[PDB]
Coordinates of C-alpha atoms and ligand atoms in Angstrom, one line a residue:
Chain A
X1 CA 0.0 0.0 0.0
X2 CA 2.6 2.5 1.2
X3 CA 6.4 2.6 1.6
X4 CA 7.4 1.2 5.0
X5 CA 9.4 3.5 7.3
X6 CA 11.8 0.9 8.6
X7 CA 13.7 -1.8 6.6
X8 CA 12.6 -5.3 7.6
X9 CA 16.1 -6.7 8.1
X10 CA 18.4 -3.9 9.2
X11 CA 16.0 -1.1 10.2
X12 CA 17.5 1.9 8.3
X13 CA 15.1 4.8 7.7
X14 CA 13.9 4.2 4.1
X15 CA 10.4 5.9 4.1
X16 CA 12.0 9.3 3.6
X17 CA 14.0 8.2 0.5
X18 CA 10.9 7.0 -1.5
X19 CA 9.7 10.2 -3.3
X20 CA 13.3 11.3 -4.0
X21 CA 13.8 7.9 -5.5
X22 CA 10.8 8.6 -7.7
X23 CA 12.5 11.9 -8.6
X24 CA 15.6 9.8 -9.6
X25 CA 13.1 7.9 -11.7
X26 CA 11.7 11.1 -13.1
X27 CA 15.4 12.0 -13.9
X28 CA 17.6 10.0 -16.3
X29 CA 19.0 7.8 -13.4
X30 CA 18.5 4.0 -13.7
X31 CA 17.7 1.8 -10.8
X32 CA 21.2 0.8 -9.7
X33 CA 22.8 4.2 -9.9
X34 CA 19.9 5.8 -8.1
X35 CA 20.0 3.3 -5.3
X36 CA 23.7 3.9 -5.0
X37 CA 23.2 7.7 -4.9
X38 CA 20.6 7.4 -2.2
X39 CA 23.2 5.8 0.1
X40 CA 21.9 2.2 0.1
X41 CA 25.0 0.1 0.3
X42 CA 23.6 -3.2 1.6
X43 CA 21.2 -5.0 -0.7
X44 CA 18.3 -5.1 1.8
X45 CA 17.4 -1.5 1.4
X46 CA 17.9 -1.8 -2.3
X47 CA 15.3 -4.7 -2.3
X48 CA 13.0 -2.6 0.0
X49 CA 13.0 0.4 -2.4
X50 CA 13.1 -1.6 -5.7
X51 CA 10.5 -4.3 -5.0
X52 CA 8.0 -1.8 -3.4
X53 CA 4.9 -1.1 -5.3
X54 CA 3.2 2.3 -4.8
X55 CA -0.5 1.3 -4.3
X56 CA -1.5 4.3 -2.2
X57 CA -2.4 6.5 -5.2
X58 CA -4.5 3.7 -6.8
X59 CA -6.4 3.5 -3.5
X60 CA -6.8 7.3 -3.2
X61 CA -8.3 7.2 -6.7
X62 CA -11.1 5.2 -5.1
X63 CA -11.2 7.3 -2.0
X64 CA -14.4 9.1 -1.1
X65 CA -12.8 12.6 -1.3
Chain B
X24 CA 15.4 -12.0 43.4
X25 CA 17.5 -11.6 40.2
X26 CA 20.5 -13.9 40.9
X27 CA 19.8 -17.0 43.0
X28 CA 22.3 -19.7 44.0
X29 CA 21.6 -23.4 43.9
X30 CA 23.8 -26.2 45.3
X31 CA 24.5 -29.4 43.2
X32 CA 22.4 -31.6 45.5
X33 CA 20.9 -31.7 49.0
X34 CA 24.3 -32.2 50.5
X35 CA 25.0 -28.4 49.9
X36 CA 28.4 -28.8 48.2
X37 CA 30.1 -25.5 47.4
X38 CA 32.2 -27.0 44.6
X39 CA 29.4 -27.2 42.1
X40 CA 27.1 -24.1 42.1
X41 CA 24.4 -22.9 39.7
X42 CA 23.5 -19.2 39.5
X43 CA 20.1 -18.5 38.0
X44 CA 20.0 -15.0 36.6
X45 CA 16.8 -13.3 35.7
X46 CA 15.9 -10.8 32.9
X47 CA 19.2 -11.6 31.1
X48 CA 20.3 -13.0 27.7
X49 CA 23.3 -14.4 25.9
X50 CA 25.2 -11.1 26.2
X51 CA 26.0 -11.0 29.9
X52 CA 26.1 -14.8 30.1
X53 CA 28.8 -15.1 27.4
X54 CA 30.7 -12.1 28.7
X55 CA 30.9 -13.5 32.3
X56 CA 31.7 -17.0 30.9
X57 CA 34.7 -15.6 29.0
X58 CA 35.8 -13.4 32.0
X59 CA 35.6 -16.3 34.5
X60 CA 36.9 -19.1 32.2
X61 CA 40.4 -17.6 32.4
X62 CA 40.3 -18.2 36.2
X63 CA 42.8 -21.2 36.7
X64 CA 40.7 -22.5 39.6
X65 CA 37.6 -23.1 37.5
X66 CA 37.2 -26.7 36.2
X67 CA 33.9 -26.2 34.4
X68 CA 32.1 -23.0 33.5
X69 CA 28.9 -23.1 31.4
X70 CA 25.8 -20.9 30.7
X71 CA 22.6 -22.1 29.2
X72 CA 19.1 -20.8 28.5
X73 CA 16.1 -22.7 30.0
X74 CA 13.6 -21.6 27.3
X75 CA 13.4 -18.7 24.8
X76 CA 10.0 -17.7 26.1
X77 CA 11.2 -16.7 29.6
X78 CA 14.1 -14.3 30.1
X79 CA 16.5 -16.2 32.4
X80 CA 19.8 -18.0 32.2
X81 CA 21.5 -20.7 34.2
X82 CA 25.3 -20.5 34.7
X83 CA 27.1 -23.5 36.3
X84 CA 30.5 -23.2 38.0
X85 CA 32.6 -26.2 39.2
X86 CA 36.0 -25.4 40.8
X87 CA 39.1 -27.5 41.2
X88 CA 39.8 -27.7 44.9
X89 CA 37.7 -26.4 47.8
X90 CA 36.7 -23.0 46.3
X91 CA 33.1 -22.0 47.2
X92 CA 32.5 -21.2 43.5
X93 CA 31.0 -17.8 44.6
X94 CA 34.4 -16.1 44.9
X95 CA 35.2 -16.9 41.3
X96 CA 31.8 -15.4 40.4
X97 CA 32.6 -12.1 42.1
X98 CA 36.1 -12.2 40.7
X99 CA 34.8 -12.5 37.1
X100 CA 32.2 -9.8 37.7
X101 CA 34.9 -7.4 39.0
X102 CA 37.2 -8.2 36.2
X103 CA 34.5 -7.6 33.6
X104 CA 33.6 -4.3 35.3
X105 CA 37.3 -3.3 35.2
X106 CA 37.6 -4.3 31.5
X107 CA 34.4 -2.2 30.7
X108 CA 35.8 0.8 32.6
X109 CA 39.1 0.5 30.8
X110 CA 37.5 0.2 27.3
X111 CA 35.2 3.1 28.1
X112 CA 38.2 5.3 29.1
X113 CA 40.1 4.2 26.0
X114 CA 37.2 4.8 23.6
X115 CA 36.5 8.3 25.2
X116 CA 40.2 9.2 24.8
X117 CA 40.3 7.9 21.3
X118 CA 37.2 9.9 20.3
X119 CA 38.6 13.0 22.0
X120 CA 41.9 12.9 20.2
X121 CA 40.2 12.1 16.9
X122 CA 38.0 15.2 17.3
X123 CA 41.1 17.2 18.2
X124 CA 43.1 16.1 15.2
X125 CA 40.2 16.5 12.8
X126 CA 39.8 20.2 13.5
Chain C
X2 CA 56.5 -26.3 12.3
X3 CA 54.3 -27.3 15.3
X4 CA 54.8 -23.9 17.0
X5 CA 53.8 -22.0 13.8
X6 CA 50.6 -24.1 13.5
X7 CA 49.8 -23.5 17.2
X8 CA 50.3 -19.8 16.8
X9 CA 48.2 -19.8 13.6
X10 CA 45.4 -21.6 15.5
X11 CA 45.5 -19.3 18.5
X12 CA 45.9 -16.1 16.6
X13 CA 44.4 -16.5 13.1
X14 CA 41.1 -17.8 11.7
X15 CA 41.8 -19.4 8.3
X16 CA 39.0 -19.5 5.7
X17 CA 39.2 -22.6 3.5
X18 CA 37.6 -23.4 0.2
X19 CA 34.8 -25.5 1.8
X20 CA 34.8 -24.4 5.4
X21 CA 36.3 -22.1 8.0
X22 CA 38.8 -23.5 10.6
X23 CA 40.1 -22.2 13.9
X24 CA 37.0 -20.3 14.7
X25 CA 36.8 -21.1 18.5
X26 CA 38.5 -18.9 21.1
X27 CA 41.1 -21.1 22.8
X28 CA 43.5 -18.7 24.7
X29 CA 42.5 -20.1 28.1
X30 CA 44.7 -21.5 30.9
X31 CA 45.2 -25.2 30.6
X32 CA 44.5 -25.4 26.9
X33 CA 48.1 -24.7 25.8
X34 CA 51.2 -26.0 27.4
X35 CA 53.9 -23.5 26.4
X36 CA 51.5 -20.6 26.9
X37 CA 50.2 -19.1 30.2
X38 CA 46.8 -17.8 29.1
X39 CA 45.8 -16.9 32.6
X40 CA 44.0 -13.6 33.0
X41 CA 46.3 -10.6 33.4
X42 CA 44.9 -7.1 33.7
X43 CA 48.2 -5.4 33.0
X44 CA 48.8 -7.3 29.7
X45 CA 45.2 -6.6 28.6
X46 CA 45.6 -2.9 29.3
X47 CA 48.9 -2.9 27.5
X48 CA 47.8 -4.7 24.3
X49 CA 44.3 -3.2 24.0
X50 CA 43.8 -0.1 21.8
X51 CA 41.0 1.7 20.0
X52 CA 41.6 3.5 16.7
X53 CA 38.7 5.4 14.9
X54 CA 39.2 5.4 11.2
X55 CA 36.0 7.2 10.2
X56 CA 33.5 9.3 12.1
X57 CA 30.7 11.4 10.6
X58 CA 27.0 12.1 11.5
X59 CA 25.1 8.9 12.3
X60 CA 28.1 6.8 11.3
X61 CA 31.2 5.5 13.1
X62 CA 34.0 3.0 12.3
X63 CA 36.6 2.0 14.8
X64 CA 39.1 -0.8 15.3
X65 CA 39.5 -2.5 18.7
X66 CA 42.7 -4.5 19.2
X67 CA 43.1 -6.9 22.2
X68 CA 39.4 -7.5 23.0
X69 CA 37.8 -10.9 22.5
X70 CA 34.8 -12.1 20.5
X71 CA 32.7 -12.5 23.6
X72 CA 33.0 -8.9 24.8
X73 CA 32.7 -7.7 21.2
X74 CA 29.4 -9.6 20.7
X75 CA 28.2 -8.4 24.1
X76 CA 28.8 -4.8 23.0
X77 CA 27.1 -5.3 19.7
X78 CA 24.0 -6.9 21.3
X79 CA 23.8 -4.1 24.0
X80 CA 24.0 -1.5 21.2
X81 CA 21.3 -3.3 19.2
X82 CA 18.8 -4.0 22.0
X83 CA 19.9 -2.8 25.4
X84 CA 20.4 0.9 24.6
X85 CA 17.2 2.8 25.6
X86 CA 15.7 5.6 23.5
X87 CA 12.5 7.4 22.9
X88 CA 9.8 6.2 20.5
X89 CA 6.1 6.6 20.0
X90 CA 4.0 4.1 22.0
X91 CA 0.5 5.6 22.6
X92 CA -1.7 7.0 19.8
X93 CA -4.9 9.0 20.5
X94 CA -6.9 9.4 17.4
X95 CA -9.6 12.0 16.7
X96 CA -11.7 11.5 13.5
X97 CA -9.1 9.8 11.3
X98 CA -10.7 9.8 7.8
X99 CA -7.5 8.7 6.0
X100 CA -7.5 5.6 3.8
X101 CA -4.5 4.3 5.8
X102 CA -5.7 2.1 8.6
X103 CA -5.6 3.4 12.2
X104 CA -3.5 0.5 13.4
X105 CA -1.2 0.7 10.4
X106 CA -0.9 4.5 11.0
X107 CA 0.0 3.9 14.7
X108 CA 2.6 1.3 13.7
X109 CA 4.1 3.7 11.2
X110 CA 4.2 6.5 13.7
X111 CA 5.8 4.2 16.3
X112 CA 8.7 3.4 13.9
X113 CA 9.5 7.2 13.5
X114 CA 12.6 8.0 15.6
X115 CA 12.6 10.9 18.0
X116 CA 15.6 13.2 18.5
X117 CA 14.9 13.5 22.2
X118 CA 17.8 12.6 24.6
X119 CA 16.8 9.4 26.4
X120 CA 19.1 10.0 29.4
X121 CA 17.0 13.0 30.4
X122 CA 13.9 10.8 30.8
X123 CA 13.0 7.8 32.9
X124 CA 11.0 4.6 32.4
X125 CA 7.3 4.8 32.8
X126 CA 6.1 2.7 35.8
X127 CA 3.7 -0.2 35.3
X128 CA 0.4 1.3 34.2
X129 CA 0.0 5.1 34.6
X130 CA -1.3 5.6 31.1
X131 CA -1.9 9.3 31.8
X132 CA 1.9 9.9 31.8
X133 CA 3.9 12.5 33.8
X134 CA 6.3 15.3 32.7
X135 CA 9.3 13.2 33.5
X136 CA 8.6 10.0 31.6
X137 CA 6.6 11.0 28.5
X138 CA 6.5 13.3 25.5
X139 CA 3.5 14.5 23.4
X140 CA 3.5 15.1 19.7
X141 CA 0.4 16.7 18.0
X142 CA -0.3 15.8 14.4
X143 CA -3.2 17.6 12.8
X144 CA -3.3 17.8 8.9
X145 CA -6.5 18.7 7.0
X146 CA -6.1 18.2 3.2
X147 CA -8.2 20.5 1.0
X148 CA -8.3 21.6 -2.7
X149 CA -6.0 24.4 -3.7
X150 CA -8.0 27.6 -4.3
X151 CA -5.6 28.7 -7.1
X152 CA -4.5 26.0 -9.6
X153 CA -4.3 25.4 -13.3
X154 CA -7.3 24.2 -15.3
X155 CA -5.9 20.7 -15.8
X156 CA -3.6 20.3 -12.8
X157 CA -2.8 16.6 -13.5
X158 CA -0.2 16.4 -10.8
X159 CA -1.6 16.1 -7.2
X160 CA 0.8 18.7 -5.9
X161 CA -0.9 21.6 -7.8
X162 CA -4.5 20.3 -7.2
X163 CA -4.3 19.6 -3.5
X164 CA -2.4 21.0 -0.5
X165 CA -1.0 18.9 2.5
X166 CA -1.9 15.8 0.6
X167 CA 1.3 14.1 1.8
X168 CA 1.6 14.1 5.6
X169 CA 5.3 14.3 6.3
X170 CA 6.7 13.9 9.8
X171 CA 7.5 17.6 9.8
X172 CA 3.9 18.4 10.6
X173 CA 4.4 16.8 14.0
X174 CA 4.5 19.6 16.7
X175 CA 6.0 18.8 20.1
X176 CA 3.6 19.9 22.9
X177 CA 5.6 20.7 26.1
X178 CA 4.3 19.3 29.4
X179 CA 4.9 21.1 32.7
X180 CA 8.4 22.6 32.5
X181 CA 9.7 20.7 29.5
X182 CA 9.6 23.9 27.4
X183 CA 12.2 25.5 29.8
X184 CA 14.4 22.5 30.1
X185 CA 14.5 21.7 26.3
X186 CA 15.2 24.6 23.9
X187 CA 13.1 25.1 20.9
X188 CA 14.1 22.8 18.0
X189 CA 15.7 20.0 20.1
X190 CA 12.5 17.9 20.4
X191 CA 11.6 17.0 16.9
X192 CA 11.5 14.2 14.4
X193 CA 15.0 13.0 13.3
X194 CA 14.7 13.0 9.5
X195 CA 11.8 15.5 9.1
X196 CA 11.1 14.0 5.6
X197 CA 9.5 10.6 6.5
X198 CA 6.3 10.1 4.5
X199 CA 3.7 9.0 7.0
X200 CA 0.6 8.8 4.7
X201 CA -1.0 10.4 1.7
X202 CA -4.3 12.2 1.8
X203 CA -7.1 13.6 -0.4
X204 CA -9.4 16.6 0.0
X205 CA -12.0 16.0 2.7
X206 CA -9.8 13.6 4.6
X207 CA -8.2 14.7 7.9
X208 CA -5.6 13.2 10.3
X209 CA -5.8 14.4 13.9
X210 CA -3.9 12.5 16.6
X211 CA -1.7 12.8 19.6
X212 CA 1.4 10.6 20.2
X213 CA 2.7 9.7 23.7
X214 CA 6.3 8.6 23.6
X215 CA 8.0 6.9 26.6
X216 CA 11.5 5.5 27.2
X217 CA 12.1 1.9 26.2
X218 CA 14.8 -0.5 25.1
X219 CA 15.2 -2.3 21.8
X220 CA 14.8 -5.7 23.4
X221 CA 11.1 -5.0 24.1
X222 CA 10.5 -3.7 20.5
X223 CA 12.6 -2.9 17.5
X224 CA 11.3 0.7 17.4
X225 CA 13.5 1.6 20.3
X226 CA 16.7 0.4 18.5
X227 CA 18.9 3.5 18.1
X228 CA 21.4 1.9 15.7
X229 CA 20.4 1.1 12.2
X230 CA 23.3 -1.3 11.6
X231 CA 25.8 -2.0 14.5
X232 CA 28.1 -4.8 13.6
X233 CA 31.8 -5.9 13.8
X234 CA 34.0 -7.9 11.5
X235 CA 37.4 -9.5 12.0
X236 CA 40.3 -7.6 10.3
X237 CA 41.5 -9.6 7.3
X238 CA 45.2 -10.1 6.7
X239 CA 46.0 -11.6 3.3
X240 CA 49.4 -13.2 3.0
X241 CA 51.3 -14.5 0.0
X242 CA 53.0 -17.8 0.4
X243 CA 55.2 -17.3 -2.7
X244 CA 56.0 -14.1 -4.6
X245 CA 53.4 -13.8 -7.4
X246 CA 54.4 -11.7 -10.5
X247 CA 53.6 -11.5 -14.2
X248 CA 50.1 -11.2 -15.7
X249 CA 48.8 -13.7 -13.1
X250 CA 49.5 -11.0 -10.5
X251 CA 46.9 -8.8 -12.3
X252 CA 44.5 -11.7 -11.8
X253 CA 45.0 -11.2 -8.0
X254 CA 43.9 -7.6 -8.4
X255 CA 40.8 -9.0 -10.1
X256 CA 40.3 -11.8 -7.7
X257 CA 40.3 -9.8 -4.4
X258 CA 38.9 -6.3 -3.8
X259 CA 40.1 -3.6 -6.3
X260 CA 41.7 -1.7 -3.4
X261 CA 43.6 -4.4 -1.4
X262 CA 46.0 -5.9 -4.0
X263 CA 48.2 -3.4 -5.9
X264 CA 50.6 -4.2 -8.7
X265 CA 54.0 -2.5 -8.9
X266 CA 56.8 -2.5 -11.5
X267 CA 59.9 -2.9 -9.3
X268 CA 62.1 -4.1 -12.2
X269 CA 59.8 -3.4 -15.1
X270 CA 57.7 -6.5 -14.3
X271 CA 54.3 -6.4 -12.5
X272 CA 54.3 -7.9 -9.0
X273 CA 51.3 -7.9 -6.7
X274 CA 51.3 -7.1 -3.0
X275 CA 48.8 -6.4 -0.2
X276 CA 48.2 -2.7 0.0
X277 CA 45.2 -2.3 2.4
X278 CA 43.6 -5.6 3.6
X279 CA 40.9 -3.6 5.4
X280 CA 39.0 -2.9 2.1
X281 CA 38.7 -6.6 1.3
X282 CA 35.4 -8.3 1.9
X283 CA 36.6 -11.9 1.4
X284 CA 34.5 -12.8 -1.6
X285 CA 36.6 -16.0 -1.9
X286 CA 37.0 -15.6 -5.7
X287 CA 40.7 -16.7 -5.6
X288 CA 39.5 -20.3 -5.2
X289 CA 38.1 -20.2 -8.7
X290 CA 41.6 -19.9 -10.2
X291 CA 43.2 -23.3 -9.9
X292 CA 46.9 -22.1 -10.0
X293 CA 46.4 -19.2 -7.6
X294 CA 44.7 -21.3 -4.8
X295 CA 48.0 -22.6 -3.3
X296 CA 49.7 -19.2 -3.5
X297 CA 47.5 -17.2 -1.1
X298 CA 46.3 -17.8 2.5
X299 CA 43.2 -15.9 3.5
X300 CA 43.0 -15.3 7.2
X301 CA 41.3 -13.2 9.8
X302 CA 42.9 -11.6 12.9
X303 CA 41.2 -13.0 16.0
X304 CA 42.0 -10.1 18.4
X305 CA 41.2 -7.2 15.9
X306 CA 37.6 -6.2 15.4
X307 CA 36.4 -3.4 13.1
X308 CA 33.1 -2.1 14.5
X309 CA 30.8 -0.2 12.1
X310 CA 27.9 1.6 13.8
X311 CA 25.4 3.4 11.6
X312 CA 22.7 5.0 13.8
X313 CA 19.2 6.3 13.1
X314 CA 20.1 9.9 14.1
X315 CA 18.8 9.9 17.6
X316 CA 22.2 10.7 19.0
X317 CA 25.9 10.5 17.8
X318 CA 27.2 6.9 17.7
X319 CA 30.1 7.6 20.1
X320 CA 27.6 8.5 22.8
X321 CA 25.8 5.3 21.8
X322 CA 28.9 3.1 22.4
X323 CA 29.5 5.0 25.7
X324 CA 26.0 4.3 26.8
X325 CA 26.3 0.7 25.8
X326 CA 29.4 0.3 27.9
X327 CA 27.6 2.1 30.8
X328 CA 24.6 -0.3 30.5
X329 CA 27.0 -3.3 30.7
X330 CA 28.7 -1.7 33.7
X331 CA 25.3 -1.2 35.3
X332 CA 24.3 -4.8 34.8
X333 CA 27.6 -5.9 36.3
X334 CA 27.1 -3.5 39.3
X335 CA 23.5 -4.7 39.8
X336 CA 24.6 -8.3 39.9
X337 CA 27.5 -7.5 42.2
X338 CA 25.1 -5.7 44.6
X339 CA 22.6 -8.6 44.4
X340 CA 25.5 -11.1 45.3
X341 CA 26.6 -8.9 48.2
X342 CA 23.0 -8.7 49.5
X343 CA 22.8 -12.5 49.3
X344 CA 26.0 -12.8 51.3
Chain D
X355 CA 4.2 20.4 -27.1
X356 CA 6.2 17.2 -27.1
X357 CA 6.1 17.1 -30.9
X358 CA 7.3 20.7 -31.1
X359 CA 10.1 20.0 -28.7
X360 CA 11.1 17.0 -30.9
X361 CA 11.0 19.2 -34.0
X362 CA 13.2 21.8 -32.3
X363 CA 15.7 19.3 -30.9
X364 CA 16.1 15.5 -31.3
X365 CA 16.7 15.1 -27.5
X366 CA 13.8 15.8 -25.1
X367 CA 14.0 15.8 -21.3
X368 CA 11.1 14.2 -19.5
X369 CA 11.4 16.4 -16.4
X370 CA 11.2 19.6 -18.5
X371 CA 8.1 18.4 -20.2
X372 CA 6.5 17.4 -16.9
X373 CA 7.3 20.8 -15.4
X374 CA 6.0 22.8 -18.4
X375 CA 2.9 20.8 -19.2
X376 CA 2.1 20.4 -15.5
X377 CA 1.0 16.8 -16.3
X378 CA 1.6 13.6 -14.3
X379 CA 4.5 11.2 -14.9
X380 CA 2.4 8.5 -16.6
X381 CA 0.8 10.8 -19.2
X382 CA 4.3 12.2 -20.2
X383 CA 5.6 8.6 -20.3
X384 CA 2.8 7.5 -22.6
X385 CA 3.4 10.6 -24.8
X386 CA 7.1 9.8 -25.1
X387 CA 6.8 6.1 -25.6
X388 CA 4.6 6.7 -28.7
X389 CA 7.4 8.5 -30.5
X390 CA 10.7 8.2 -28.5
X391 CA 13.1 5.7 -26.8
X392 CA 15.2 6.0 -23.7
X393 CA 18.9 6.6 -24.4
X394 CA 21.1 6.5 -21.3
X395 CA 23.0 9.8 -20.5
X396 CA 21.0 11.5 -23.3
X397 CA 17.3 11.4 -22.4
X398 CA 14.7 10.5 -24.9
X399 CA 15.6 10.2 -28.6
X400 CA 13.2 10.1 -31.6
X401 CA 12.7 6.4 -32.6
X402 CA 13.2 7.0 -36.3
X403 CA 16.3 8.6 -37.8
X404 CA 16.4 11.9 -39.7
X405 CA 14.8 11.1 -43.1
Chain E
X13 CA -31.4 14.4 17.7
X14 CA -29.7 15.1 14.4
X15 CA -28.4 11.8 13.0
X16 CA -26.0 12.5 10.2
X17 CA -24.9 10.2 7.3
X18 CA -22.6 10.5 4.2
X19 CA -23.6 9.6 0.6
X20 CA -21.6 7.2 -1.6
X21 CA -20.9 9.7 -4.4
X22 CA -21.8 13.2 -3.3
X23 CA -20.1 12.7 0.2
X24 CA -22.4 15.3 1.7
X25 CA -23.6 15.4 5.3
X26 CA -27.3 14.4 5.2
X27 CA -29.6 14.4 8.2
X28 CA -32.4 11.9 8.1
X29 CA -34.6 10.6 10.9
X30 CA -36.0 7.1 11.6
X31 CA -38.1 5.2 9.0
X32 CA -37.0 7.4 6.1
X33 CA -36.4 6.1 2.6
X34 CA -32.6 5.9 2.2
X35 CA -31.8 8.6 -0.4
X36 CA -29.6 11.7 -0.8
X37 CA -30.3 15.2 -2.1
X38 CA -29.1 16.4 -5.6
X39 CA -28.5 12.8 -6.6
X40 CA -30.2 9.4 -6.5
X41 CA -27.6 7.1 -4.9
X42 CA -28.8 4.7 -2.2
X43 CA -25.6 3.8 -0.3
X44 CA -25.4 5.8 2.9
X45 CA -22.4 5.3 5.2
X46 CA -22.2 6.5 8.9
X47 CA -19.7 9.2 9.9
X48 CA -16.8 8.3 12.2
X49 CA -17.4 8.6 15.9
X50 CA -16.1 11.5 18.0
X51 CA -15.1 9.4 21.0
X52 CA -11.4 9.1 21.9
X53 CA -9.8 5.8 20.9
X54 CA -6.4 4.6 22.2
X55 CA -4.1 2.6 19.9
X56 CA -0.9 0.7 20.6
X57 CA 2.1 1.2 18.3
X58 CA 3.1 -2.5 18.8
Ligands
ZN1 ZN1 17.9 -2.2 4.9
ZN2 ZN1 -25.2 12.1 -2.6

């Protein structure tokens, strides 16, 4: 649904690096170089950010509003 | 009510003692095991966990001669405390000189 | 000879092709004949040393020489779990119209770190849900999303159409209790990162809540863990059994880390040597080359531990290590006092 | 606007189009995929060469 | 006592009393949700 704040394995703060990651996707950066620039050395945070699906906007499209 | 002693049998033999320590885990158990294993008067030192649900550990100490096995316990505790104080002082001094040389 | 093998077993940990050997700590009295491994405080204070190699905000790296694996693991576990911090525990909700569930919202708020100094607070007693000035903190979060009165005709992006549609943790306002406003200057009590995305809203929805934070340790729950990654590794020391030169030496530079093996032209020919064994991660890729297996000997120093501590930003990591050592000292003192009370 | 940017220059930046047109990322992506391909370190290039 | 409800598409606060045909003004939708309560609820971050 939404990006988790904490990483499951280590616990590094990753929720604050989601939208900026999307910015790196709006820019010309690929996946690997963007994850490297975000400061994710260990592969657990890379999996957390890469394998995450942004389903919050799809649900808000069905929100009452 | 945290640390309780238990003799090896009803005979109340001071050679083999079991210390049950509450609200502890592998950290202090292993640290005290390492700090007291170097005591030459200890034949057998060993810590174990009764069950992962409850937070308690059981250490067992068996000495060589007629040691009450409580004196090595206090010896290991004091040695671990001294080691911790020394490493704390060394780390503080190291951090201080690093901050000084960085600026 | 036999003495060299004994020294290698008691000082080095060798990594083989199929398994690691000499992994158990054995320097104890009675295990070795020609060695008096009895405890000596003077020798320990002489041989032990701490050297910090890197220290920035929320990151520390330091090598300890002379300590054992038991005390190193104890320090690591105390840092991971037994260091108390401040984190959100109670969530009082007033008309949460968000799509995000209330329990999920409370769970996300609990994982948000707090920059408050834990040493200035105390543990809340059993019960006492009302909380006191000493052992709690209050954070008010009130965000009402609404349509932007001035926007483009299309406004496809949600940023232009709506305002406050993404509830960042910067909207959290610390509400002082009693005399906490005078003790803590403005700006000290606040979220650590200030950019954590809590939830996303739509016009009409509102998120109103209060968060009660109390002191707690990481053993009870992972949200109190101050360190993100606090670990230690044995310092590698790669040694060459025979001098390797020629193009195969370049293979060494490609087998190990790029920054550990360096090739030099002493007489016009390339010869490889160990430059900085610290940068090596022991990928064990030298075992693939058949010829170069019997020319190197990968090993780890037993009494040299490089600690890497990356924290979540609650407090600098040096203070974290100091508080971990203080917690271990407090456990030792509590057990000594209990033993003295027994006798 | 995208076709005009392509007529003016062969390379088109996605972020610039998203900022100017004020559109979402998916609409700009669909507009670009119909007539452009992603070239690393260069942005979006027209799929067919200059005829 | 004013009992308030929310429509499924207009999302407007409509006040209807007992034994009324479930409907909503300026539309014809017949799905009527209840507003969230005003009582304080305590949650645990565990
Ligand atoms: Zn991670
Ligand atoms: Zn309606």
